[PDB]
Ligand binder design. Structure first.
Ligand code: HEM
Ligand SMILES: O=C(O)c1ccc(-c2cccnc2)cc1
Ligand SMILES: [Cl-]
Length: 393
């Protein structure tokens, strides 16, 4: 009934060009079995959406990586939000929602936009830059650690820690095992910055600790929720902004449309999230026997959701492989769907919008002018190096 495939979706060959293998996974059937790792897979939009939206059957508290927390010890104490199910999930989620709220966005927007305009002006003075290190990484580094309230010393640990977190959702391949081998100094730094005295007043970290007296979370929960933001909030935006710039570099017609109407910036970023799907994959674990797209999956089974494949499924999308900045993107699953849908999506969209607005207003052309190098990670899709010449408007 269920087709068995030997595709390794965590192999470097797959990361280097996932699209043929993703079509193979979709067209093999609504549910496949991946013999390489002994997990079920779903790569069509319909089944990915269905799994995301049934958290009771497809739970998160046994881990959203390959490892089953019921069988192995997690590599660090479990997340109180990403790796929790309702009802334990509900109040931590409510707190991060209020911390990363519309009102917080209103407080930080003008500074985030100024930093974006400043970065693009700086990059235009150089002309030839690396859109990864010099833009996708430098811009989030210039705003997010400060918005968290982190001290200056030690910020060089943040991207390495994120790379570790995202590799650790994967199977025990060399990417994962190498990351864990090198983890100890990054864990030590991060865990220390999560304590209330180390988080500057008014930042996201202090706000989490401020919410510990409402009955939603206790003081001893606040450090691990700060940990959630220090795990998630930087490398995601690096690869979302990188995705958008790479799209604009490859599709000059869409850069030209964005220049002519800079208010398309927010949707241009959203389409880049659909088109590249920088967060590629998450797992769930079945809590019972279940029928999904005609197949029967037993209890205690890992299910791998291919978010990026779902976002290119022609059963759901017209011209899925076209970057279209005026596409109706609502319903894409690049930020998830349902009770765990990205609680940081307003930060992500703010950063992406203000960066693409700065490009739309200041840049006439983005031309790749050097070798493109991909960055390999078990969960994140994105580039290591993207050499571009920026032409000023
Ligand atoms: C382009 C950028 C981003 C993308 C594509 C993205 C993608 C996602 C996805 C797919 C999920 C669902 C996980 C699941 O269902 O198991 C998620 C959840 C989450 N994201 Fe993001 N994310 C981004 C940015 C951010 C940022 C900037 C932050 C923090 C400031 C953040 C914090 C979180 C948290 C805390 C969760 C867990 C929510 C929950 O379990 O209820 N994310 N994200
Ligand atoms: O440590 C955590 O709780 C945590 C770690 C990573 C994420 C995450 C992953 C992908 C996109 N957005 C957020 C979320 C939460
Ligand atoms: Cl840690």
């Amino acid at each position: 009934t269920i087709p068995h495939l030997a595709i390794d979706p965590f192999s470097l060959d797959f990361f280097d060009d996932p699209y043929p293998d993703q079509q193979t996974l979709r067209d093999a059937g609504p549910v496949v079995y991946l013999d390489k790792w002994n997990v079920y897979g779903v790569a069509r939009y319909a089944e990915v959406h269905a799994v995301l939206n049934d958290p009771t059957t497809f739970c998160s508290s046994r881990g959203v990586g390959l490892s089953d927390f019921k069988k192995e010890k997690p590599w660090r104490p479990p997340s109180l939000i990403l790796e929790a199910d309702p009802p334990a999930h509900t109040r931590p989620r409510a707190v991060l929602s209020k911390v990363l709220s519309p009102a917080t966005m209103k407080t930080i927007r003008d500074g985030f936009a100024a930093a974006a305009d400043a970065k693009v002006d700086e990059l235009l003075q150089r002309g030839c830059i690396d859109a990864i290190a010099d833009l996708a990484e430098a811009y989030p580094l210039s705003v997010f650690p400060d918005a968290m309230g982190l001290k200056q010393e030690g910020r060089e640990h943040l991207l390495p820690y994120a790379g570790l977190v995202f590799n650790a959702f994967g199977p025990p391949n060399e990417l994962r095992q190498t990351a864990i081998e090198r983890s100890a100094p990054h864990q030590a730094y991060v865990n220390e910055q999560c304590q209330r005295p180390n988080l500057a007043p008014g930042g996201f970290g202090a706000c989490i600790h401020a919410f510990t007296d409402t009955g939603e979370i206790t003081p001893d929960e606040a450090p691990l929720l700060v940990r959630s933001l220090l795990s998630a909030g930087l490398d995601t935006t690096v690869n979302g902004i990188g995705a958008a710039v790479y799209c604009l570099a490859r599709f000059p017609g869409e850069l030209q449309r964005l220049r002519s109407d800079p208010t398309l910036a927010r949707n241009a970023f959203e389409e880049a999230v659909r088109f590249e799907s920088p967060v590629q994959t998450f797992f769930r674990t079945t809590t019972r026997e279940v029928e999904l797209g005609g197949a029967v999956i037993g209890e205690g089974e890992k299910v791998l959701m291919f978010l990026g494949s779902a976002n290119r499924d022609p059963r759901r999308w017209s011209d899925p492989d076209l970057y279209d900045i005026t596409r109706k993107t609502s319903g894409h699953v690049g930020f998830g769907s349902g009770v765990h849908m990205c609680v940081g999506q307003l930060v992500a969209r703010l950063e992406g919008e203000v960066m693409l607005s700065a490009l739309a207003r200041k840049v006439a052309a983005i031309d790749i002018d050097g070798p493109v190098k991909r960055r390999f990670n078990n969960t994140l899709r994105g580039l290591e190096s993207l050499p571009v010449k920026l032409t000023p408007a």
